[PDB]
Amino acid sequence: MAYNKEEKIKSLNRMQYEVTQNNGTEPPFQNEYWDHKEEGLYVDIVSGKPLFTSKDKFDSQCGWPSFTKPIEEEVEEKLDTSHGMIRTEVRSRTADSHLGHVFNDGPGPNGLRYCINSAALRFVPKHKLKEEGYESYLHLFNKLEHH
């Protein structure tokens, strides 16, 4: 039995779906291997799209990594109501809906609490980003606009 990056994402997206659908938590795995604190990004594995930086990462101390800073490019903040209370979730339309949930109780630029699940995440070091397209990744990890 072979195993390619296609079959990687296919088997993966079952578990990513388990999180999106039921708010399902990954089992005890999310440690120094999966979310390694070396400089880079934390991306939704389904697409490899930048959600938040390792430069400004918060660790899974509150169960899931919850920082004040999203990446405005591929992250959509989207209001909902389950039962009498409103909530906001960060969720794309097509595929990236696995990101996480954000709350107006957390202080931020807009005043949202950027809380992403570790199951949907892979650490991608600045070294590995250079292999995968640094001009897309490192631009969001580190930029400057000299006027």
Please list the residues that pair with 23 across neighbouring strands: none
User: Nearest Cα to 60, choosing from 23, 20, 28, 24?
Assistant: 28
Report how far residue 129's alpha carbon sits from residue 114's, in angstroms, rounded to the nearest whole number.
22
Experimental technique used?
Answer: NMR
Cα 36 off chain centre by: 14
Q: Catalytic residue among 19, 115, 116, 124, which?
A: 115
Please name the CATH architecture into which domain 1-147 falls: Beta Complex (2.170)
CB 42 within 8 A of CB 122: yes
Tokens 């039962």 sit at which residue? 83
Report how far residue 24's alpha carbon sits from residue 80's, in angstroms, rounded to the nearest whole number.
19
Cα-Cα-Cα-Cα dihedral sign, residues 24, 26, 28, 30:
negative
**Among this protein's residues, is 62 annotated catalytic?**
no
Alpha helices in 5-144 (DSSP H): 5-22, 126-132, 134-141
